[PDB]
Amino acid sequence: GVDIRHNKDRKVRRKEPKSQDIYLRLLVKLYRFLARRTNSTFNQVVLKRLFMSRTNRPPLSLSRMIRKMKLPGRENKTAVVVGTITDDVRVQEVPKLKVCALRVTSRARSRILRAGGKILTFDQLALDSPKGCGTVLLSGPRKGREVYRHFGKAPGTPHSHTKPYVRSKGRKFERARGRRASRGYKN
Amino acid sequence: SAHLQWMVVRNCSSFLIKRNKQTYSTEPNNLKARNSFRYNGLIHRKTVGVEPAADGKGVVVVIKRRSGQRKPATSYVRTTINKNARATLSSIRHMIRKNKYRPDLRMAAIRRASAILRSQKPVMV
Amino acid sequence: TWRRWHRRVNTTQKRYAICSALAASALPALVMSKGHRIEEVPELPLVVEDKV
Amino acid sequence: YGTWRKAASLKSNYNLPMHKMINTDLSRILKSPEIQRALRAPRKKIHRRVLKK
Amino acid sequence: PSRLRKTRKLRGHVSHGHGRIGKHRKHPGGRGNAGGLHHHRINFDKYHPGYFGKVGMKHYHLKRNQSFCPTVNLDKLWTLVSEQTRVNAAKNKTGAAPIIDVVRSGYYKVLGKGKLPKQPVIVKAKFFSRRAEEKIKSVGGACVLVA
Amino acid sequence: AALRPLVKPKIVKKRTKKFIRHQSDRYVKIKRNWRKPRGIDNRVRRRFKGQILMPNIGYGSNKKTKHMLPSGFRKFLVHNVKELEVLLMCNKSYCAEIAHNVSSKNRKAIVERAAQLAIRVTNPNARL
Amino acid sequence: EPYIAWGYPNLKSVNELIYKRGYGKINKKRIALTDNALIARSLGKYGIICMEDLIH
RNA sequence: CCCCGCGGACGCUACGCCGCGACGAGUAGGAGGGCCGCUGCGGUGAGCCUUGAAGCCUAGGGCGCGGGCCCGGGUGGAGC
RNA sequence: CGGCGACGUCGGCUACCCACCCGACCCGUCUUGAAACACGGACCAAGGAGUCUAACACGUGCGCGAGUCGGGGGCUCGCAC
RNA sequence: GGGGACCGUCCCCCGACCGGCGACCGGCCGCCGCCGGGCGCAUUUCCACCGCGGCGGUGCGCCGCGACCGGCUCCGGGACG
RNA sequence: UUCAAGAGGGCGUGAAACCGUUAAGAGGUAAACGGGUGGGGUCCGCGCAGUCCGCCCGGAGGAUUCAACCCGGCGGCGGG
Ligand SMILES: [K+]
Ligand SMILES: [K+]
Ligand SMILES: [K+]
Ligand SMILES: [K+]
Ligand SMILES: [K+]
Ligand SMILES: [K+]
Ligand SMILES: [K+]
Ligand SMILES: [K+]
Ligand SMILES: [K+]
Ligand SMILES: [Mg+2]
Ligand SMILES: [Mg+2]
Ligand SMILES: [Mg+2]
Ligand SMILES: [Mg+2]
Ligand SMILES: [Mg+2]
Ligand SMILES: [Mg+2]
Ligand SMILES: [Mg+2]
Ligand SMILES: [Mg+2]
Ligand SMILES: [Mg+2]
Ligand SMILES: [Mg+2]
Ligand SMILES: [Mg+2]
Ligand SMILES: [Mg+2]
Ligand SMILES: [Mg+2]
Ligand SMILES: [Mg+2]
Ligand SMILES: [Mg+2]
Ligand SMILES: [Mg+2]
Ligand SMILES: [Mg+2]
Ligand SMILES: [Mg+2]
Ligand SMILES: [Mg+2]
Ligand SMILES: [Mg+2]
Known about the structure:
The structure is cut from a larger assembly and holds one copy of chain A, one copy of chain B, two copies of chain C, one copy of chain E, one copy of chain F and one copy of chain G.
Chain B: H1 2-9, E1 16-19, E2 22-25, E3 48-52, E4 59-64, E5 76-81, H2 85-97, H3 106-120
Antiparallel strand pairs in B: 1-2, 3-4, 4-5
Helix pairs in contact in B: 2-3
Chain E: H1 6-9, H2 41-47, E1 71-73, H3 83-91, E2 99-101, H4 102-105, E3 109-111, E4 122-125, E5 127-128, H5 130-138, E6 142-145
Parallel strand pairs in E: 1-3, 2-4, 3-5, 4-6
Chain F: E1 74-78, H1 81-84, E2 94-98, H2 104-116
Parallel strand pairs in F: 1-2
Bound molecules: potassium ion (K) (9 copies) and magnesium ion (MG) (20 copies).
Chain F binds four RNA strands through strand 1 and helix 2.
PDB class: ribosome
Keywords: Ribosome, In situ
Entry title: In situ human 80S consensus ribosome with EBP1
């Protein structure tokens, strides 16, 4: 007998996409080969993002992509996102962008192309930059989800600002005892 | 595309046989008759198949031409070889190797031709 | 009787299933893999005159 | 059902779904000189366990 | 699909996953939200503060239509008109500014979140916030009220 | 005489006897089919010495000789002549056998065809 | 103290332990020291390139 | 600048195949896999069957760690 | 490298009966603790117990995406499907 | 209320340059391959039989024996410091 | 009579428990069970002088036609 613990032997991580999308599986095959047969760590990151779930591949708005592309030294670089690129109607000027995405919204696609931009899929990105040279790997806001407002410390604990689960919002719904000093306590 | 069509029929096909911990594929131009991307006789732009002749002697070497991929009526060119075994294998070797027409199927077609010819010669007592 | 026998499928889902079905019906390997004996058919996006 | 450059004229809001992979020819992509130039050499020798003498 | 559920895997296991000691019994602890101030007090206090007690003034016969006042922010303001409208105004030589009627688009109040492009515009709304009015005048526009 | 396999390795079976169910000897109502004992005090489940053994993955056969018949072949069930030609290129590793429901007239043609293709049949003389 | 037996090995004990039962932790794997290249690849930066260097 | 030889095993169901190292108790409980099993529906097997289906019986031959499964013989008589 | 092979023998660790050596208390259940002088169980067959609806929460898959969704209604020879 | 103008997407055409004939196809050439028919009718080629032939592979119907090599292990002699 | 009464008016199939008879084996620690052998028996193995097949060598026979050229057809690849 040996003195070890076996509760952490099996690392919990995606070794493949749980999706049955045959097109996603094809470009997983392409980037499984690229990650193995190159020393590019860019291919390793892209490959493991391809396995990720939809909640782990948040959409990237056009405004956020433009703002990251406008940073110094990123001219003539390809914006790579492993997910959906989304139109942001809050912006009025779209510059010229070279973009690779898993998926682009129709309105966002029209805006990028009309501004002289270029849109690539991940198969075309492999031919353009097999090692991912001259690319900016972007990601949508991972915690930009309603669930994360409810996560954290319990709402009925001091110094916790987490949203409780309520069927309705109003003066009659969970605004009394434990929420104000007049009604017992507040914390 | 061959890779895309493979992802559709790798597990869902009328030619698929899955029995006794084994898997076989019964499409017309499958050498070795195995379910595999390399040996699938439907998904590739160029394929080679070896079948016994219509009568009980010789082999039929069918290749897939490159032009009418969506026109199955004229997509396959069938030739019949009815000579001695050594000469028959040489013709199949030259068709595959000299033309550079799917060289990865050279020995599979040659072995299948040998099996067909070996089955055509009369049994003994 | 109130087992919820029916399911609603988004219209964009359903239109996208039709597009996939139509695109697959023009590829010989997929139609053959359904076992349709399209051996001697002249052309698989198979179109005939309006006279029919 | 429209084209990719025309919306459908009989569905008032439908357009053809977009490909997430334009060229689904894995063999051709992998054999392209752009891919092959960036690759390291294949490691095809099999190293089996050595019997410790 | 019942073939994908835990019941198919719990056959042959006597307690069906509920345990030998505690068993699976009808209603231990009460039914529904029973004992929210008694034996379930910690859960209600921990996860649902404010649940117990009255706060505020009640109002009989509330009519939600009377309080109907949808709002739009300034960042989304130019989306209420066509793209032709905004390019024409920008390249217009004169001082002619387009009119945006947010009531027509379905909004009553104009809020002032975001920033406006540097071009004048006439905004028609039932209500304006103080900062929305200031930002509209900063780009040389005007705010006019409607009923 | 009979068609020989490509290779005939020595087949090693870790256990040659069936795993009988606990107390299947004492009751007709309990069949020999294996069932894992889950009782709190069951001595077979607790693995006391001298008791009925429990199947586990350690008894697994060598992957090189798994599903191998004593003759060195592996079996593929066939129902007609068409399914017999899938074994044409697997002649020396896989043997055909005819399904029980196949008629006497039809399995005569299967046996005749398999003799031609050098495919071994496990039940060649099965309705005659 | 109650769980171990220990002492001061001599030169012969070190040699026979390393040569007969010497295994290296190479890439978190237990690899038998059958070649000097296994020692030099992982310990060459420290000047140790053979079994004799490891024993020294 | 292969050529007296025109030739040269296998492979790669990539959900595949191959290599190396460590490890393996388990109630309550959790999860995964199941080419384990039952019934019915959409497809598919140019599937099986009165030249004998289902079912049942069997000192018959085997396969799987196992759930179980295939085949021989008998009975049976219309489906699987 | 040797011996032996048809009406007597050769191989078949499986499977039938028997013998011997070693090991071996009857399961299920509650329980700190069951072989218990703790309960249920004579035997066999067939039946027999986490289901459906609604509402939430989180995870995963799919479509679209600052939008999304026709589920109620209506239009399509009114209906083999 | 119309009818116009403009703008955005389109449309089939009249035409040139641009990258390529592509996994959208034809005609000509060039090389190669296969097939059919002639010629070639024998130191070529092919078919079947025989040798208790050789070289390779697989494997011996059953029961046995030996040899050397390597791994692990338990022991025994001899000699040196 | 019937194809069949091993379908004979509560009659398709006809399981298990339980019982009768026949056959084989055994029997003073109740039976039953796990592991290991041994004996006997029913069967299985076309068991019974025990593989196949690639090249080459030798012997004894047949058949065209072997290569290369000519004509025709069809393919693969390349072409400013
Ligand atoms: K963790
Ligand atoms: K549970
Ligand atoms: K276990
Ligand atoms: K079916
Ligand atoms: K099994
Ligand atoms: K039967
Ligand atoms: K009792
Ligand atoms: K509706
Ligand atoms: K009857
Ligand atoms: Mg251990
Ligand atoms: Mg553990
Ligand atoms: Mg359990
Ligand atoms: Mg039970
Ligand atoms: Mg219980
Ligand atoms: Mg077994
Ligand atoms: Mg029993
Ligand atoms: Mg216990
Ligand atoms: Mg365990
Ligand atoms: Mg109890
Ligand atoms: Mg007590
Ligand atoms: Mg007990
Ligand atoms: Mg007692
Ligand atoms: Mg009690
Ligand atoms: Mg009872
Ligand atoms: Mg009682
Ligand atoms: Mg039952
Ligand atoms: Mg009868
Ligand atoms: Mg009866
Ligand atoms: Mg009896």
